[PDB]
Design a protein around this ligand. Sequence first.
Ligand SMILES: *[C@@H]1O[C@H](CO)[C@@H](O)[C@H](O)[C@H]1NC(C)=O
Ligand SMILES: [Ca+2]
Ligand SMILES: [Ca+2]
Lengths: 83, 82, 196
Amino acid sequence: EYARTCAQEGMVLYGWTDHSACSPVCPAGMEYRQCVSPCARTCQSLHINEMCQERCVDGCSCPEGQLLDEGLCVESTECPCVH
Amino acid sequence: DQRVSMPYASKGLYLETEAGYYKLSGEAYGFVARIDGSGNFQVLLSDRYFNKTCGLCGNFNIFAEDDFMTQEGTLTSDPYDF
Amino acid sequence: VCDATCSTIGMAHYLTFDGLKYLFPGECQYVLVQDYCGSNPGTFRILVGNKGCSHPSVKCKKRVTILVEGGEIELFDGEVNVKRPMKDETHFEVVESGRYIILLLGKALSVVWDRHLSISVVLKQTYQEKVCGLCGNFDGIQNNDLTSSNLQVEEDPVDFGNSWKVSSQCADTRKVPLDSSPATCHNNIMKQTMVD
Ligand SMILES: *[C@@H]1O[C@H](CO)[C@@H](O)[C@H](O)[C@H]1NC(C)=O
Ligand SMILES: [Ca+2]
Ligand SMILES: [Ca+2]
């Protein structure tokens, strides 16, 4: 709560969970980033840049690749199609 | 009473999931509410409601000494009878 | 070949360039027309954002953002608001005549807005199978206006439009069971006759 406060007051603070020995819980595959963007490019998204210029947000997201597809992380090669 | 799926967008409210965390945005009405994985609640609220709102999250002036304006309109010191 | 014209006839209907009315009620933000399609370098990207408009009512105010020449001019609440001026300001041109905001953006692009709901982007021969979106591709063929983002035709328009949403994590609008009596004309046959 102290971190989330100081971020809202206009000072984001990084890497405080590396040694704190308390990882905030998140589902399988994703781990707690700090300051991730809300418009994470997923597997069935349009490549539409310089539009999601919202504030940076705390939360958990997939690894560097490993895009999102219906509440899990999967590598971009295994992206499905939709019909 | 009817259980509905998610996402959901009715009536100016977008019930979504951002960054693993559930979100309920009401930017037309002027609020954003999200719950995290541990169950902790959070409410972001616009400056339109400055010293206007009151409730369990108090009012939105700057002073913290007067966040206990009861529903009767009086101050308090015990957090509970508030 | 003449100039073509999209349209947003009412709250939830769209008339393609080649001419195709279809029903798509949505509440997310959608690509109405863009030149960034396939192997094109591309120049512009027009979007349309509705809110509370899955059910047509005195709700459903539309917002429109248009992205051209590095610009960002958007509009809602009966007014036009620039957010980022574009480089070649010479082609930018606004005409506030009558019930409408006419809005010129180039030799072959234009927008016409009645300040409430109707969006009529006008294009010329210059493009001619270089665009795509909810308005189609402007090629003369009317049967291929439902080619989605994933490069196939759908038989159902409600699955076509959800291909063109801008945020992948907002809601997919639901398949409504097809009825001639939409919402309030359903049980009241008189109000279905007074409306006719
Ligand atoms: C906040 O609103 C109340 C309404 O009665 C007013 O009395 C008070 O002075 C306001 N405080 C400020 C300075 O905004
Ligand atoms: Ca206070
Ligand atoms: Ca066509």
